[model samples]
Target: GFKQDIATIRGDLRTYAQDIFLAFLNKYPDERRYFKNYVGKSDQELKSMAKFGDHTEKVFNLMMEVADRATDCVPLASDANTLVQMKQHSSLTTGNFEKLFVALVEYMRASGQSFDSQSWDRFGKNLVSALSSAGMK
Candidate 1:
């Protein structure tokens, strides 16, 4: 119900990959620093960018995958892939997925989803705590 419930949660709420990241970047301005290609680009020009579309969907799809697979959704060995993904998410060593998870649900809530948004709260903490325990943090 968590991952697949997105459509029923809101009318016409499906999002393209670039749209998701652009929306996220717009709301969370500080994090936009990572996407140097998008940082100063005009809104009209954003959709034309090549890789942003590729990567944003990649990121969103990943979130869907994790939410689908999480058990305790809380720790290191409940599934090492969770930890491995966390490592990948924080590959820059900017280990702060707890913050990102909250931001994700926060994004979800603001964008026409209010029901069970807290599930992501549980999701991020459970998945991220493992990273913390296993030294990703």
Candidate 2:
């Protein structure tokens, strides 16, 4: 199951989140304004913020739920769309969401884990399909 794929990387999630957030901020420096509460802080400092921690937990939980329900198409789409919608309201673009996948692959590589490109692609497409199915352009 995809849960296994996710679980293989589970132990590294916090650092993964931190790295992804750092990449997002670095790539879109102006986007930092969206997180006013975290302004002027370094990447590591941002990770220590309660808001950042909570955001990481919620998004990871959503991803975990998605992986667990991979065999159930409808629920998978629903949950994926829920996550997409959350991002839709943020400063993040679909492109930024795509960057998250890139961050994940990089994290796996840096952690000395086997990077499964196909599995990552499939997971990404599944979520993208879910977004389209939910009427997101």
Candidate 3:
């Protein structure tokens, strides 16, 4: 019944990415001393830092230089299919999922966020476990 609200999800993904970026900057304060210099900066300054004035052109360009890398709806599929759909959504084929995923990645990159694959893996595993406990498996 879901239409895959690409725009809404894209915005949400961006928000999530921004949150991740903020958390990462906070996590690695020392590596990002430039941020340290703005410890008591006014709200506008903070906002400026977050957006990286000029709208992150240089930073995002440099980040993409390193590399660039990626949907659907209908009745609920089986667990394996749902997982497949998730993976597909992370790619650029089929639907709005790709846009949302890329928007999320873009936001993270613009904000200079780094995440550990291991942590993400563990979280996914935990989520699967919870769902299986609920009898999805």
lDDT of each: 0.57, 0.64, 0.36
Candidate number achieving the greatest TM-score relative to the actual structure: 2
Tens digits of per-residue lDDT for model 3 on 1-137?
11222323333544443454444455444424444455655434555564543233433332222122101212122432443344322332222222322343444346443533333333334334433443442
**Which candidate order results from sorting by TM-score in descending order?**
2, 1, 3
Give candidate 2 misplaced runs (Cα > 4 Å): 27-34, 72-75, 84-93
TM-score for all models, in order of appearance? 0.68, 0.72, 0.29
Superposed model 3: Cα runs more than 4 Å off: 1-20, 35-37, 42-45, 49-51, 55-57, 69-137
C-alpha lDDT of candidate 2 relative to the true structure: 0.64
- Cα lDDT of model 2 by residue, 1-137, tens digit: 34555675476777665665676677667667666787888876777688887776666766756766776323476676676577534444455556666655455556555656556666766666676676565
Task: Supply the global lDDT for candidate 3.
Answer: 0.36
Residue 74: error of model 3 in Å?
Answer: 36
TM-score between model 3 and native: 0.29
Best by lDDT: 2
lDDT of 1 by residue, 9-85 (tens): 23332354455455556666777676677778865577667776566666756555555566544433545355455
Model 2: which residue pairs collide? none
